[PDB]
Design a protein around this nucleic acid. Structure first.
Ligand SMILES: [Co+2]
Ligand SMILES: [Co+2]
Ligand SMILES: [Co+2]
Ligand SMILES: [Co+2]
Ligand SMILES: [Co+2]
Ligand SMILES: [Co+2]
Ligand SMILES: [Co+2]
Ligand SMILES: [Co+2]
Ligand SMILES: [Co+2]
Ligand SMILES: [Co+2]
Ligand SMILES: [Co+2]
Ligand SMILES: [Co+2]
Ligand code: NA
Ligand code: NA
Ligand code: NA
Ligand code: NA
Lengths: 221, 221, 221, 221
DNA sequence: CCCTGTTAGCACAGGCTGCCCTAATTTTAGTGG
DNA sequence: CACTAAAATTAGGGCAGCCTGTGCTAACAGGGC
């Protein structure tokens, strides 16, 4: 059928994910993350620009238009409501719902959404801690590991694991094994290479590269 | 993204659907049902034949190969397990689950399938009475209105409403309103034009064309 | 490329030719003259009716609409101006120009038409005697052998040989050999089978079937 | 009927035209010139290759087969004999004959060709200077502006204006106004962008892009 | 029968858009010699 | 200022999926002689 299921939507959500991670939305990013060639992401963006879903600014960063953002949210909303349903009701293992939802997010009707809201008791986040956007236009409804000073370790409590980390399954798995998940006290220390090392009381240590770090939100506590 | 989500799968399932209805699997049929041009379905079938999913026989009827059938079933299975999940758990309205499932059927993993089996207590049919196929290769596990003699009406109990009828949403709705659903005593009489008229005690009458009739199974009772 | 070069135009021009011959414009006719199956001419007529070029009446005879006739004339005009150019200037043999122009009639620009008018000195007929139509909307500008009483022969002077006769090349050739051409005194007598026999002083006799006869205009003289 | 009148022939002639201009015959070229999509030209070339009219070489350039070239010439021959007839006899204005012939080239019989030879006194070129090919198979019968060294202007005499230039009507018009036509002394100098500037004694200057330049043959004199 | 159409299924030529790829180049911004 | 890593562009294609125009055959339907 199609790897991504829906190219445009996956481009939009990748744009969004990058913003959520606090990194500059460049075309080069999309290529890395969706594993497509440079020429491809460029030609694809065009079609998208030509359809008023986004604009390539002066510095070349991607800017979502009024329309483009509305949709991007829409997809992200379904995505997370799905991960909820998969973990809570369906009972699918944690380190597997993201990849499943990354597909469902492109077919869930807006109706099934609403009904899922009522069946999960007006949830507000995903099994990974990220908030469910666009909940009201549907009809209802803290730092980043990179923003942590180096030097001496720090005690914090894991609050969010944005989609990007959810991507590397090998890692999202290790993190579960070492308990690094929402509402989990743990200490982190800035590595030499802009990275971050997580010290979990009881389990082996786990180090995240600068990029992966941009995708973990914690609370200084 | 794509109307059908996945063309090939929908062509396979339509082949299957026709068999289930007991009508000969011609390319002309697929074109009607998927609303595509003759040339389109032809060219698409070829690609399919070229990948050994089906063969066009001498009389030109479509025959699913060993491989093709296995996949066709896999789809039909996800389809029905989903309609189950949509009606029972999610709580989505009856005359709406089919259209929703027609899309989910192309993205549900085999894993989510199995778990849905346990969550629904090893169901064996869909909210419309059709059996869930390939349940064992997964890892677990009466007449047709056309075959009804003409003349005087006959009391029967609606047992199945195959996917074809679920298709015409306007009709599947009327049928719900008139109560014509699984385990429902009603009488049927053969119309002049090979059609069939259903007399529901209490609600307006409802007449089905010969084609739609091929898609309703009942039990002489 | 295409036998007819342009299906639609040839259908229009055949309708026109039929009128010119005084026979009823039925779809059956077009099928015979363009050598195409019944189903083909029908479906093609629909496309034409759907584009308002003609209408199928109550008796089923074909009626050219305002638009359809304007175009029809336009083609006939090019066809005849071309036959002129082919015989007078190019110098292509008589019994061959018709077939050539039947193709040129579908590519001659309206401009080349006007200039051909000046190069041939405002002609008004074809090498076969038929009048060049629509000459003013461009920008410038007697009985039928069937309508002849039977019994005793009649002296007449050949005035026109409509396209239909130009069609049968074997016949249009014999007619040339027997001198039966425009401005030629000859006698004709009605045969038993609604046909007609032409008596040419000097050459063998030549008999035309009722149909071919509908395509020859003469002057009682 | 059809924009090109005859796809295959136009493709063949475009291959020829490209060779005549000294540029590599790529599918991408055809697409540009006949204004059709990439996929279209590709699929069409296949039908052509499948019928042994051409072959796509290793470097992907198009090679006309024995048969393919014969036909190609045939079309080019008609095309030019026609431009001759249009200008000399019909009297159609210069910057208009090419477009007309581009259509007549697909319907002129081999007989009408021969006869046009005799009517134009065995011509050997077109009103633009290009030689009339395949004249013997019928039955009868210097540098390129890009190959000109840069630096100081050069006096040359325009000898040919290949079809490609005849295409851009706006340009072929200007060239007439500035007298740049066969047997015309004029000077040309290489522009920075691989282009070429023609200096006509008396009329405004005229600059041709690198591509157009590939389409003009002259004689160093 | 003969003369006219209709109904149902397909074929092949011609055209198109959305997505994706590789081989080169080019364009951006910094970076030390 | 040459040099570069990083990010894009330029060039020429590939395959999946959709369309309309034109043509044909087998079979069947109706009216009138
Ligand atoms: Co996720
Ligand atoms: Co996705
Ligand atoms: Co950073
Ligand atoms: Co269903
Ligand atoms: Co489906
Ligand atoms: Co039946
Ligand atoms: Co004629
Ligand atoms: Co014609
Ligand atoms: Co008559
Ligand atoms: Co020309
Ligand atoms: Co042409
Ligand atoms: Co060049
Ligand atoms: Na890829
Ligand atoms: Na369609
Ligand atoms: Na035919
Ligand atoms: Na085009």
């Amino acid at each position: 059928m199609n790897e991504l299921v829906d190219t445009t939507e996956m481009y939009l959500r990748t744009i969004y994910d990058l913003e959520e991670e606090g990194v500059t939305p460049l075309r080069a990013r999309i290529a890395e993350r969706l594993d497509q060639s440079g020429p491809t992401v460029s030609q694809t963006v065009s079609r998208m620009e030509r359809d008023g879903l986004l604009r390539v600014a002066g510095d070349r960063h991607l800017e979502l238009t009024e329309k483009g953002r509305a949709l991007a949210i829409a997809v992200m909303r379904k995505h997370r409501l799905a991960e909820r349903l998969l973990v809570d009701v369906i009972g699918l293992p944690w380190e597997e719902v993201h990849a499943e939802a990354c597909r469902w997010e492109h077919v869930m009707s807006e109706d099934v959404e609403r009904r899922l809201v009522k069946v999960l008791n007006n949830p507000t986040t995903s099994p990974f801690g990220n908030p469910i956007p666009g909940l009201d236009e549907l009809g209802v409804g803290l730092v980043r590991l990179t923003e942590l000073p180096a030097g001496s370790p720090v005690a914090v409590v894991v609050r969010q694991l944005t989609e990007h980390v959810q991507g590397d399954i090998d890692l999202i798995t290790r993190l579960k094994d070492a308990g690094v998940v929402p509402n989990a006290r743990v200490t982190v220390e800035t590595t030499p290479g802009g990275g971050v090392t997580i010290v979990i009381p009881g389990h082996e240590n786990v180090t995240l590269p600068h990029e992966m770090a941009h995708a973990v939100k914690v609370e200084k506590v």
